[PDB]
Design a protein around this ligand. Structure first.
Ligand SMILES: [Mg+2]
Ligand SMILES: [Mg+2]
Ligand SMILES: [Mg+2]
Ligand SMILES: [Mg+2]
Ligand SMILES: [Mg+2]
Ligand SMILES: [Mg+2]
Lengths: 253, 253, 253, 253, 253, 253
């Protein structure tokens, strides 16, 4: 049931995918998170204490969950992507995608030659140790590549990036984008808001779905109205912090 | 700093202490939990996958937190209590205390001879490796013992148990008490509610504060009105499960 | 999905169940082991370095596997069984069951009151954090109890043990039985073989299936012919040791 | 290589064995500790955060070290001893041995039937997965049992305990003995010193070597003069705490 | 109490800071190390088995310690620095800083745009999950950057490096410097000694404090006399090795 | 006994070395794997979930094994090699070695200046914390460098690569080579077979031994006949998968 990648297809079909970020970096809470019904969960390897050692336990925790696991790599480089592919990730979120070349490299990092440069191994979690049918051929067509536009250069080259073959979705990272535009900590600033819609619009111009992280409901709904389809509406860490604080406050004397 | 035990003092003063249960068994989420402001947190070793290997990481995660760490032991026996004391626990929740003798044994398990049977070690987290002043003497007077009345025999012997020297609080375990009274999964049944009130009354009669676990706000508020002072109003697990499901439902209905 | 317990049903139907022991105590190899197709896998907590900290990772590794996970507890006592139940084990192998009383205690340790003495918790892996329907009621009828007859007293009391309500299967532990009969390391001795057949006969007399661990194919096949139905035919450790040595020998003689 | 047990032989010969306690509970520092040249190292499972999960890593860290690994069990009970034996421990320190019966039980817990009650497993670290020659037979004669006399009853019954077959050494636990004699934290009190000498004398009377833990050089040297042969002269924790504080003080006064 | 960074200020004030290296890579011994009173502790990620998985446990172990935690990164590259910042490190030691450009990149790696290129996340250990006041603004002014001059190129460009804005301290790595000058294993060679004082002197010429690692007391004091202020006087590993060996030797027969 | 490197010498002597790949990434099974008698074991860090955290436990597990540990790095870059050297690896397998420059960099990454660029540390597992005699000098001559030729560029430059000083062996990675030649998943294709023998032949032309991974016996023997000497004949993962599946199939009804 590994292939076809249902998430990748849903995205292409322009269907709304509701997601949740994951930074708690442990299999116990992540197993619980997998019961919520989110369409996709982002195991953050860039801003959370996640790595191969924590990723496998969480992927195992998510076995049976309807949620599509997505790894947000620490950076766009071929080696860590090679390693994350074999441990079982079929969907990737690439931070700071600033040029056409970088978008091409990200895609190539997930495809075996001649299409890409992915290193070959005959047995691992990805092909469930040789039990995944026609693995080598099917893998090349079933990896989701979501590139993050969150820098001025990325915005400048958004068209070339979105036009890149293999780039399945254009994702806006609000915090870094805001910082890039001189508005650190203030993504709601008008100029950042304009940049966001511009990114969504250019994604659409190239037939690629757009996405974003929006933990504030009002923002998430506005982005959805603007045409975004794969929207992360919060994070396990954020809801845990908020919910635990609220419970304590409710009884505060 | 370690001593005097403020939590123990707060209980003796019959001051309200709002707590939260912990079963996520990992230092990452627990550090966040420590920011909530709960007066006490129960690291569950009876019904959650916690053990000494997970307890120390979480105790370290809670260093600096205003929340008093309390360990709920897997069972009332000397050995594990001996080990939990040395790793840094100064507050204990003892499950299934059904007789005066069992109450006395729990207390004795936390005190050095001649008062108790606690094994002696000269350096460990508890005396912060020899840096806690007058440790041996002060330790015996600074351990909190909270006994759980959650069985028919426990209810029958509640007076002798509450009258036991060293028993700092009388805690009601709703689920086991309900089951013991023939109402598994129905702690709201009048038979159970009546026993709870009775337990609270007898704790008061012997000058000991009473407590209970009540994840439903209405229940927690009723128990507080009845006079319980150390009330756990939820769990990190319950809060996490509910909050994540809620976020998903908000967008997926 | 969790209930009804198919393994328990298969045993009641006297259907053959081929199992494999597990002592490698890690999620990496165990996930691979789950692909083999064994009807049941025994995560050994008595003679292998397994504990709750290693059990959950392996249970997660086995999610989706057709193999029924069975835990062989370190000893027949209430507390550890209580803890193993909540982390997600629905099938148990109990070592050294020597009397009717011990058999009854093992069964009781897995059932909530009034039928048993199992401690109650409202959320854990066992009820998949509150998502298992009618959990409390169904759990009591869906736990498999396999008792090990591996001592002289166990043999003497095999009838009373097999007649005990809740005892789902009569399992022979070859090594301990051989030692108990004065033939340490020689389970093939006629004295031992005779006791095994006798045990199988008495299990059948009380309508309970019998089982045994037999890493030698000829032995396993003989025991199956004698009528044993849940037979462990090897271990991940034994298989690994043998296969790796064999590969090396093929080239180094 | 595994057998014969050289440490056990050294004790029988009444040869001095200098040991060091270990509580740092991790393989990194323990590997370094194994380079020190101590005759024996005690991996403390009673007063340090050690358990099977930390024991195997440290045993592996000590492979090749001339130091004999000794585990100090959390308590004198059959089950944990059974488990510690299989993971690779051949030398045991038993806390609170107070009667002849308890001494006999500790010994029996390490020997296979008919001599003892040790559970049988055909492959584990102890027999290095089936590579230790004549394992079953040799194991029964190669386990070291060191009993701790550290309670008033233990002192009263020291003769019967020392006379017990299988008891290889009589070890004095200073801290618990002092506490038992009403001198908590004052093992130097004459009452305690007198009991120690008496214990040493009775061990000698029954042809068994005596030992003790003495982190203060003057104390260790006095005990050696009195006739103790297996003396732990410190702990990795005590040495580390002292040495690091000393280095800091050298520059900060 | 996260900001202001007291260590960073102390350094700027030219106050002597006594430090200790840490390579034991575990929270147990590191918690003990934090009680010694060192002004700073270097959790080595370049030559010790430390990484994100070991760093968080040790940072938690150091909560409450007066010692300022400093991470010595594996190499000077933006990605690992990004990750180490979010896990809670506010002080960095950068190995092999050989050019002005590299010094600039190291500084920029720790500052949010427009000042630097640090990736943005709204919740993590660094801002204690949103509880650190005015975090985004304050963080950019509270990160300590200590660059290592330990290569011939670094020596050649020491002036440009020390003149770089954001470079708070010039640290000499003796072992690599010695090797670079053709004196591997002999930092005491006259030419290496001259290079060291030259580095200290150029640091001073640009108003930046100088530092070095000197486990031999005589060397540490000489360097202090030469004007160095942040001097690491040993390591947890070195003192442990020395102290354990000395204890054993003291009793060697 | 660390130096001289016996494996490195055996290779130079053109002696056949039978190896086995390791991807199970845990110390339990790897300790067992070390008993098989393979001449070398490759702890895979490129296609298996291995890293520093898993490498040290496995190296400790292999202490006492006659098998030479070899790490296959995730990629050819100086930083991870620096780190792997200090943790105790003396033999390296470098993936995708495509040019003379890259071969030179790999060699240099393992040698201290002036020969190479290896970073210097005075105490770590590699010099067993200062106990390895004449370490600094001997290390530079005792590291085995095995470069992988598994790309078209590597084949084109095989002569320059094999001629590089310090390159001890030319290893063919079949899967990547096949993919590079347009035959993904089909290394048996005639053109790949020709490329393999060509690589072996060019290795010989420069006096360097050749090696390859060949899990199919017929292939391994053919390669040996072609002149290859360090041949990996399988993997722990592959044999485990095959052997466990076979055992289950043997009894399948
Ligand atoms: Mg971003
Ligand atoms: Mg309860
Ligand atoms: Mg048995
Ligand atoms: Mg003691
Ligand atoms: Mg250096
Ligand atoms: Mg390859």
């Amino acid at each position: 049931d590994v292939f076809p990648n249902k998430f990748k297809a849903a995205l292409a079909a322009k269907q709304v995918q509701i997601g949740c970020w994951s930074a708690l970096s442990n299999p116990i809470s992540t197993e619980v998170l997998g019961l919520a019904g989110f369409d996709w969960l982002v195991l953050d390897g860039e801003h959370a204490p996640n790595d191969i050692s924590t990723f496998i336990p969480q992927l195992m925790a998510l076995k049976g969950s309807a949620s599509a696991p997505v790894v947000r790599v620490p950076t766009n480089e071929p080696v860590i992507i090679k390693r994350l592919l074999d441990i079982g990730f079929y969907n990737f979120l690439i931070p700071f995608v600033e040029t056409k070349e970088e978008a091409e490299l990200a895609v190539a990092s997930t495809r075996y030659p001649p299409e890409g440069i992915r290193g070959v191994s005959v047995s691992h979690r990805a092909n469930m140790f040789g039990t995944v049918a026609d693995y080598f051929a099917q893998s090349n067509k079933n990896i989701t590549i979501l590139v993050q536009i969150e820098s001025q250069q990325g915005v400048d080259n958004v068209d070339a990036i979105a036009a890149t073959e293999g780039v399945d979705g254009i994702f806006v990272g609000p915090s870094d984008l805001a910082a890039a535009l001189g508005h650190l900590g203030n993504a709601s600033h008008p100029d950042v808001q304009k940049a966001i819609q511009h990114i969504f619009n250019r994604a659409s111009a190239h037939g690629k779905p757009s996405g974003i992280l929006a933990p504030v409901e009002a923002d998430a709904r506005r982005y959805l109205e603007w045409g975004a389809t794969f929207v992360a509406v919060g994070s396990d860490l954020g809801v845990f912090r908020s919910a635990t604080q609220k419970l304590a406050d409710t009884f505060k004397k």
